[PDB]
Amino acid sequence: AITEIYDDSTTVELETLEPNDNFEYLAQLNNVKL
């Protein structure tokens, strides 16, 4: 979540999204194995 402010006092919020949840699941499995 990154907020950017312009000259009109209007802010834009930009957040990256993760469509493939498998990356997190494999990462958590590897972390618990570690």
Partner 1 sequence: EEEQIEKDLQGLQEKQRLNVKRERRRKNEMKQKELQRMQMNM
Partner 2 sequence: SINQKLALVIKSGKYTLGYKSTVKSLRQGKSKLIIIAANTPVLRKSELEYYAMLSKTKVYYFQGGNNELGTAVGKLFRVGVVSILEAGDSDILTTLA
Partner 3 sequence: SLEWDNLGFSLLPWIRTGLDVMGFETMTPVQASTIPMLAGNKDVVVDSVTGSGKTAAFVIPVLEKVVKEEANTSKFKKAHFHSLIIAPTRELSRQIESVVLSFLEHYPSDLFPIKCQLLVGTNEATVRDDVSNFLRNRPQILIGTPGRVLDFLQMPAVKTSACSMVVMDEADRLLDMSFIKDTEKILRLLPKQRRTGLFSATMRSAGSDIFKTGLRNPVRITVNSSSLKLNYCVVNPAEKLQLLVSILNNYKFKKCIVYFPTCVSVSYFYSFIQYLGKRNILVNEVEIFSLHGKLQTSARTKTLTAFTDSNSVLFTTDVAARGIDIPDVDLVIQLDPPTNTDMFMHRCGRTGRANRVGKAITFLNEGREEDFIPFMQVKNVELEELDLEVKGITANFYEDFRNWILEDRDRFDKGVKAYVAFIKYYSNHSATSIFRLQSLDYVGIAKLYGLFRLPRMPEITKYLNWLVDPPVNMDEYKYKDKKREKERQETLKNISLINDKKKLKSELKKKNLAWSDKTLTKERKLERKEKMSLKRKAI
Question: Interface residues with partner 2 (CB under 8 A)?
Answer: 20, 22-23, 26
Q: Which amino acid is at 10?
A: T
Partner interacting with residue 6 (select from partner 3, partner 2, partner 1, none; CB below 5-8 Å by kind): partner 3
Smallest distance from partner 2 to CB 11, Å: 26
Q: Are 4 and 12 in contact (CB under 8 A)?
A: yes
Q: Which amino acid is at 1?
A: A
Partner interacting with residue 23 (select from partner 3, partner 1, partner 2, none; CB below 5-8 Å by kind): partner 2
Q: Are 24 and 12 in contact (CB under 8 A)?
A: no
Write the DSSP symbol of residue 9: S
Binding site for partner 1 (CB under 8 A): 22, 25, 29
